[PDB]
Structure 1
Amino acid sequence: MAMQKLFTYIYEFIEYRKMVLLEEKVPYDKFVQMVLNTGFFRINAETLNHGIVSVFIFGANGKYVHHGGDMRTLLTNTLNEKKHYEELILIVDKPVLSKKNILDIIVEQRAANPTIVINIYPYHLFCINIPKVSAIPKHKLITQEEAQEFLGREYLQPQDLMQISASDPPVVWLGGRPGDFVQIERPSETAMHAVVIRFITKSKI
């Protein structure tokens, strides 16, 4: 049921990340037909900083996943267009993350494009509205200035904090880049609730 969940929660993800859509939303059966034929579905969004974010949803059997050459071709032909790109989210099935090859093309395209964020994620990260899960505390991104004043009061360096991966599901839904700080409000059975600040490190892939 992964694709039906994706077709709703990818747009809930785009809305939660404060992005407007650059296309028209197609009926669900049209979505499935494009994924099955073209091999992927492309969603464009515009951030507040007028940057373009493109999301690629890949089928669990397409040519772009099993063969590195087609994925490389798609990445070169997507990163050569006339848009002000800010990030590429590539949504794949979970086993694709254990396949070394496609990960190597991802790392070369990161190296070949230093100002573009190339991220590859599994399906489960977008099959539910992650911020609304009960078990997940409330995450928020704080500015560099607020974090700097917090650390100056605390006599701390950013490396002294607890750290959170940039591929942590709530940090992905926030858009947390490495080097940012995420304030987390969590339930406590001793103080009834607590606040911590974590330092976003590099992603798993």
Structure 2
Amino acid sequence: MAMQKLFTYIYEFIEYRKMVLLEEKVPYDKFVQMVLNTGFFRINAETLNHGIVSVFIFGANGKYVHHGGDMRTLLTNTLNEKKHYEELILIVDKPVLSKKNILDIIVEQRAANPTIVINIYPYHLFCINIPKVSAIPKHKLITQEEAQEFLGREYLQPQDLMQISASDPPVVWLGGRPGDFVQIERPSETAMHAVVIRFITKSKI
């Protein structure tokens, strides 16, 4: 049921990122038909900063996740269009994150376009509303000014803070980038909730 959950939840992922939808929305059946035929589905979203975010939903048995050359060609072609392309999101199956060759083309493309953010994510990252999960506390990105004043009061450097990966599901849904700060309201059984600020580091892959 991975594809159904992906279809219903990727759009709320886009909305939670405060991104306006582009193109249109297609039914489930047409969605899986495109996924099986073309090998992937592409969703285009626009950020508040007038940038463009493209979400690529690849198939588990698709050719684009079995041959590295096809993925290289797709990334080169998509990055060759005329759009701001703030972030590229590629949603793949879990074993695809283990096939080292695909990760190698991902790294090569990331090096090719430094200003362009390319991240590859598993299916389970978008198969549930992550911010609504009970076990996940409320994560919120704090601006650099608030983080700087907090660090100045505490006589701390950003590297002294507790770390959080940019591939952390709450951070992914927030859109946090490495070097940013996330304020987390965690429930507490000693103080009846607490506030912690974590430093966003390099995403796994």
SS at match of 1:24: coil
Post-superposition CA distance 1:122-169 (Å, at most 9, x none): 000000000000000000000000000000000000000000000000
Asked if residue 127 in structure 1 is aligned to residue 130 in structure 2, the reply is no
CA distance in 1, matches of 2:83, 2:160: 39
CA distance in 1, matches of 2:60, 2:187: 38
Which 5+ residue runs of structure 1 have no aligned equivalent?
none
Offset, 1:76: 0.2
SS across alignment from 1:43:
strand
Aligned structure 1 segments of 4 or more residues deviating by more than 2 angstroms? none
Secondary structure in structure 1 of the residue aligned to 2:203: coil
Please give the TM-score of this superposition, normalised by the length of structure 2: 1.00
C-alpha separation in 1, matches of 2:96 and 2:28: 24
**In 2, Cα distance between the equivalents of 1:163 and 1:18?**
25
CA distance in 1, matches of 2:83, 2:47: 13
Deviations 1:69-99 (A, max 9, x none): 0000000000000111100000000000000
What value does the CA root-mean-square deviation take over the aligned residues? 0.4
Query: Which residue pairs with 2:53 in the alignment?
Result: 53
Aligned-pair CA distance for 1:63: 0.8
Q: Residue 10 of structure 1: SS of its match in structure 2?
A: helix
Distance 1:118 1:19 in 2: 17
SS of match in other structure, 2:82: coil
The match for 1:15 is 15
Separation (CA, whole Å) in 2 of partners of 1:193 and 1:34: 45
> Using the alignment, how far apart are the partners of 2:193 and 2:14 within structure 1?
29
SS at match of 2:86: strand
Aligned equivalents of 1:78, 1:99: Cα separation in 2? 22
Q: Please state whether the residue corresponding to 1:33 is helix, strand or coil.
A: helix
How far apart are residue 112 of structure 1 and its match?
0.3
SS class of match (1:85): coil
Shift, 1:22, TM fit = 1.0
Cα distance in structure 1, aligned partners of 2:179 and 2:11: 27
TM-score w.r.t. length of structure 1: 1.00
> Which ranges of structure 2 fall in alignment gaps of 5 or more residues?
none
Quick one: distance in 2 between partners of 1:189 and 1:83?
48
Q: Secondary structure at 2:3's aligned position in 1?
A: helix
What residue number does 1:168 align with? Answer: 168
Aligned mates of 2:99, 2:161 — CA distance in 1: 33
CA distance in 2, matches of 1:100, 1:186: 36
Does 1:102 pair with 2:102? yes
